[PDB]
Amino acid sequence: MRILVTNDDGIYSPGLWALAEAASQFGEVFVAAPDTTIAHPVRAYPHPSPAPHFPAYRVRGTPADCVALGLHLFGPVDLVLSGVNLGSNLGHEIWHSGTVAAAKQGYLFGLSAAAFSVPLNGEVPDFAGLRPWLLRTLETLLRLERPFLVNVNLPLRPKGFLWTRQSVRAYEGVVIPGEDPMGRPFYWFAPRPLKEAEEGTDRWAVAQGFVSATPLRLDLTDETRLQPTLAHD
Amino acid sequence: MRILVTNDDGIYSPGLWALAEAASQFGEVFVAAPDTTIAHPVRAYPHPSPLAPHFPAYRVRGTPADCVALGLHLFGPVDLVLSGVNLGSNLGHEIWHSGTVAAAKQGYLFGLSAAAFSVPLNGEVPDFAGLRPWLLRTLETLLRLERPFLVNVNLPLRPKGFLWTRQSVRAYEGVVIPGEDPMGRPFYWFAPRPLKEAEEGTDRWAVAQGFVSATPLRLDLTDETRLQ
Amino acid sequence: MRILVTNDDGIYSPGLWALAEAASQFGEVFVAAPDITIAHPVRAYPHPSPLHAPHFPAYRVRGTPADCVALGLHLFGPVDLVLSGVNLGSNLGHEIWHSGTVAAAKQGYLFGLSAAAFSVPLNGEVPDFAGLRPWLLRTLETLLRLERPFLVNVNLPLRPKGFLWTRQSVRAYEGVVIPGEDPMGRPFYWFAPRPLKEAEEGTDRWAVAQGFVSATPLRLDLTDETRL
Amino acid sequence: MRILVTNDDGIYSPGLWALAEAASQFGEVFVAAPDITIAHPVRAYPHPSPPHFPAYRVRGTPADCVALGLHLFGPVDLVLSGVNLGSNLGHEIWHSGTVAAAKQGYLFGLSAAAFSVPLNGEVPDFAGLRPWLLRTLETLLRLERPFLVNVNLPLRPKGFLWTRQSVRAYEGVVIPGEDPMGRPFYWFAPRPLKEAEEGTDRWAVAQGFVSATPLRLDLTDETRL
Amino acid sequence: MRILVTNDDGIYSPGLWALAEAASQFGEVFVAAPIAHPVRAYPHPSPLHAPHFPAYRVRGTPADCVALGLHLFGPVDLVLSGVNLGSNLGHEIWHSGTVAAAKQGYLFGLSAAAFSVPLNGEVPDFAGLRPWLLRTLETLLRLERPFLVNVNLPLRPKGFLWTRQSVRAYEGVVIPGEDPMGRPFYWFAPRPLKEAEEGTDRWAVAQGFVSATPLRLDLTDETRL
Amino acid sequence: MRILVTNDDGIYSPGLWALAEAASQFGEVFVAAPDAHPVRAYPHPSPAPHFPAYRVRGTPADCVALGLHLFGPVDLVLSGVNLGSNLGHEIWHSGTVAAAKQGYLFGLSAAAFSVPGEVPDFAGLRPWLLRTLETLLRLERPFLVNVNLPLRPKGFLWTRQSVRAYEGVVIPGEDPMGRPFYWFAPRPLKEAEEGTDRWAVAQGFVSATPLRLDLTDETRL
To answer: DSSP alpha helices (H): ranges in chain E?
Structure first.
């Protein structure tokens, strides 16, 4: 099988190259990464892979742009992988994730897809010690009914793997006033969750030391509110 | 009832004032809007509501989410968070990265009822003197629902109805066509297009039929049918 | 004229005797109501018709409503019309398919006799037969003018104020599946299918909703001549 | 595409899996089988399918299975009901639980097809009927949607045929008798006035032809309005 | 004295209202007739021919009737079930629905009795049954409490006997036969070995006496444990 | 000896063929399962060692009557294994139990077998079936025994029937739609006592309760 690897941090992110080297254990691997709805032009320049040579392209566009060009230039492609993003993509963060959107674009194009992320701020992800678990994870996804759309968060030092649901929490909008060093006022926006992540959620799983894998949906409709509204006698 | 009003087009967008005006008809309106992820600092300066009655307002040099948190601290408590009226649609796959929708969701995450308002664009501009009747009718409907609620609303340019809808979810084809600019440089045309037409009952379908579209949104992106 | 009357609620149901007394206005009445293709046994014992109206011959039957049509035609043969009802409960739209009341009539029609099923919408308040009698007589009068043989489904609201021929209501549906739980934590799904629009004028469902008795001529053939 | 498969015999019927298995040869299959309109509680339970298509046993009717089927698995593009052990021809179509489930599917907006094979004697050879189930399924999947067809496969199929429901007049044969314990009763044995007619599902199955009949939803007799 | 009258033949059985009227002669009578499940219930009119009884028609099992019955008319100190339109003697008790209701009442701490009468043949004259029906309740009411008795009234009582349940062995009589349409079948008509020993419910009602058997709830055979 | 096996879940229930196969290790087995009355039945092919089989268009009791006529003489009637419990009060309305009671009413030894979210792994239960059959086969005949095997038994135990008093909990409620109703969620006053079938299965033990046929309460006659 053939795999397209992209991300949203750039063609130089070591997480991009760690994902591609790991994807290569299961198939032909091709890379298309970002430079940084309507028909637009996209410039794509061949990029030499800094490991087993991977045909790569540097795209002047969005990650979704990469997936589309990556399928054109490298088709056929059976799977679309996005990451590994330097930074988590858990709970409410899934919504806005660029990494996730890349995988979602692949699913919308009919392929199977998965986003991979690791937490930042402090220690940098050690990709050598993460290779085993990256591999294990890929081996599992590859045993799912296709196509699939999955969101993966790997902790810094994984001890396991778990299928998770998204953490969904309420917050109290904390606004704390303050003044900068030179006198100018401002507001410190810092929302705190009203409770701890329940077990079974992606956030929990990563805090316990497990690779979290969440199957995503494309439909945002709240049918439990819609259906009753649409009913008649 | 106290209503916080915001958007993502800017304190200067007419869409924003059309909505605050319409919301006033149901309660005391407060406005907080963007100027143009974790504990971060944000600035906010008073702003005179355009002249229409006066609305306490603020321009926030941050995100629509910041506006919502900043509005609840500056005019709290609040009963409802309305975001829009956005100058561009927010149907289907677009809901995902909607700034307008982002603001409303923020209010929801704070225990409040919320709704985003969008009017389709890229051609002509909306007439908010004509849209007002449909806006009022829509708010009136929303306010009868059980609280809290999270609804996404799209209004066609000149509406002739109203439908509770579901999100249009469609598959695509990665149309990539080679080409060069009249100057000589090569490039790739990316033109994604849906494998089919929007279905009856979806938001996209409703709007194309001249109807206002109202979709109740879920916060959980988890696909439970692939988890169990 | 000879008339065979049955139902699918039982021989003690007042909905049964109301239709019998009513039919007794047009001819001699014989009753056969409850207590598979292969040949099967069926017991039938003489039953005393309630001594409150002109006593009519009757038989309690240890079988199905169709078994009833058959034994009746045999112990009372010959018969001109087979009446089934009055069913305590409605038999409208989609419901016509699995109706025991309609079924008995269809059976009579398949033996070459004219037949009609009578039902009255229930759930909550039970019918008042002294007041339905005029409507039973009026409906019966209307049916006896029809070219024979005929097969008709009749539904009468509790307090009718008119009569109308109707076609079967045919609405689209949505399967509402909302989760819940008994007072023991145990998980379960609440399932209630519901139509997606109001019933149309000219349908049985619309008529009774408006307060008009509804009558629908039925077809035996379920073949959709279109796709063939 | 995606397919929901059910029946009214239960989750253990060979007919059901002989259908799910043939269904998987055209798309993602999910099976929901059995154990009023007012809101009622329904419980489903994860059930191991014997290929491998996710499944559920539903403590409910077949309709319930289509409703639940879609909410726990759906969306879905098609509903399949069967194969029912026992035929569903002519007058029988009226009260078939097999057909009622496909019907519940159409009324929900999807295309639907109910499949059935005669019994009352010898069991069917599913692994030996696969030829025409796949063929019968190919023909339908190409039909203009949405559709609602009733399929009746004879035991040893030598062909196909679009049909019309056989509709016939009957004689209410009633012969008295008495059980061994001397008690009296009446034998009720209805029998048709004449044999099935060419073009009907009942005649087609008797000629060894797989029978499919498109079904209408409105029982209204327009030539009387 | 408050009494809940129920049954399993449904809200329109004359046997049910016949029991209520005999029961009202000894206290206030209330009526309800047909895991944690939801149950619907509606007000139902009592036959204006007898002194008004508050009644409900329940869309569930007779066990439900007793549950909802003690909730709506609570407090109740006696649950009577029947009069069933058919006997409930010997091995029949095990499976009787009329008995089940009374049983449910007992499980709830109340005393209870089930009443049955022979059907299939002729119809029971409750007016000509009211004497012994009344007398039977007088007796039942003198018993220590709570009690749980199965009662069977012959079509024309001329006495009353406390009885034991008839327990008989059977010979599995299966007689071959064929119907009119020519097809074969088997007649299963089990016949007991010996007759019904005297002192048994079956012997009593056959002599022409009302039968009353105190029932137990433990199905265990301690003598083999 | 000669063993007749039936159930009430039908001819395709793996629970019937698991009892039949287990019973074949003790005698010749014959099967008669459901889909003064008339009854029809048709030969049926067994899945696994070959057992003479029959599907009866009738009640479970019918299978027992019809099986003794077709394969008689028979010494033991085995009914099950039912998919779903049959403990305490439940015995009363058990079809599985009613089939065995039929064999008993006919002078034969009889036993009912049942197993309670998930499905039973019969290959793993087999050992407990054999072990349970041998035990039963050592009781004086005729006999009627009710047996419940938990999913993964860890013992055996001759039990009595659990007979608990209840409190009829009725709580008003209403469906999502709007239609109101009554919740009838009865509940036992106490917990299942030690040594009763229900308590026993709860402990993970196989349960076997000899059953009586007389429902008379002689202590009050």
So the answer is: 14-24, 62-72, 97-107, 130-142, 201-207
- Evaluate the omega torsion of the peptide bond into residue C152 and state whether it is cis, within 30 degrees of 0: no
Strand partners, C30: C4
Find the helix packing angle between A98-108 and A63-74, rounded to 10°.
40
Q: In the numeric block, which tokens belong to residue F75?
A: 């010494």
Chain A residues in contact with B93 by the CB 8 A cut-off are 108, 218
Element (DSSP H or E) covering residue A231: none
For A29, A98, A128, F126, the CA distances from A21, given in Å and listed in that order, are 8, 21, 11, 49
The tokens for E148 are: 């749980």
Distance of alpha carbon A51 from alpha carbon A20, whole angstroms: 10
Q: Is F52 exposed, middle or buried (0-12, 13-18, 19+ CB in 10 A)?
A: middle
Query: Does E64 carry a binding-site annotation?
Result: no
For chain F, give the DSSP string.
-EEEEE-SS-TT-HHHHHHHHHHTTTSEEEE-EE---EEEEEEE--------EEEEES-HHHHHHHHHHHH-S-SEEEEEEEES---GGGGGG-HHHHHHHHHHHTT-EEEEEEE------HHHHHHHHHHHHHHHTTSPSS-EEEEE--SS---EEE-B-----EE--EEEEE-SSS-EEEEE--EESSPPPTTBHHHHHHTT-EEEEEB-S--B-GGG-
In chain E, helix, strand, coil percent, each to 5?
Answer: 30, 30, 40
Other CB atoms within 10 A of residue A72 CB:
19
Closest to B18 in 3D by CA, of B172, B127, B143: B127
**Are the C-beta atoms of F109 and F76 separated by less than 8 Å?**
yes
By C-alpha distance, which of E41, E50, E62 is closest to E17? E50
Q: What counts of helices (H) and strands (E) characterise chain E?
A: 5, 14
Domain that holds residue A227: 1-233
Q: Which residue of D has its CA nearest to B228?
A: D46
Q: What's the rounded Cα separation, in Å, for the pair B40 and B66? A: 10
* CATH number of D199's domain: 3.40.1210.10
Residues B82 and C92: their CA atoms lie apart, in Å, by 44
How many A/C residue pairs have CB atoms within 8 Å? 20
Residues facing residue B222 across a β-bridge: A216
**Annotated binding-site residue? F9:** yes
Q: Is the peptide bond before B148 cis (omega within 30 degrees of 0)?
A: yes
Task: Check: CB of residue A35 under 8 Å from CB of residue B179.
Answer: no
Judged by 3 or more CB pairs under 8 A, whether E touches B is no
Q: Which residue carries 């340019």 as its tokens? A: B157
Q: Within 13 Å and on the Cβ side, how many CA atoms surround F114?
A: 29
Q: How far apart are alpha carbons D206 and B167 in whole angstroms? A: 49
Which tokens sit at F81? 């294994």
Burial annotation E56-78 (CB, 10 A radius, 16+ → b, else e): bbbebbbbbbbbbbbbbbeebeb
Helices (H), chain C: 14-23, 65-76, 100-109, 133-143, 204-210
CB A40 within 8 A of CB B190: yes
Ramachandran quadrant class, E223 (left: phi over 0; alpha: psi -120 to 50; beta: rest): alpha
Q: Give chain D positions within 8 Å (CB) of E175.
A: 180
- Do B9 and B87 meet the contact criterion of CB atoms below 8 Å apart? yes
Stated in angstroms to one decimal place, the resolution of this structure is 2.6
Query: What would the two tokens of residue F103 be?
Result: 């064999």
Please, which experimental method was used?
X-ray
Tell me if C191 and D41 make a contact (CB, 8 A cut-off).
yes
Contacts of E192 in chain D (CB under 8 A): none
**A23 residue type, one letter:** A
C-alpha distances (whole Å) from C224 to each of A113, C227, D78 are 44, 6, 19
Q: How far apart are CA A95 and CA C36, in angstroms?
A: 58
Cα separations in angstroms, A148 against A103, A144, B223, D49, D119 = 10, 7, 10, 20, 41
How many domains does chain F fold into? 1
Work out whether strand B193-194 and strand B172-173 pair parallel, antiparallel, or are unpaired: antiparallel
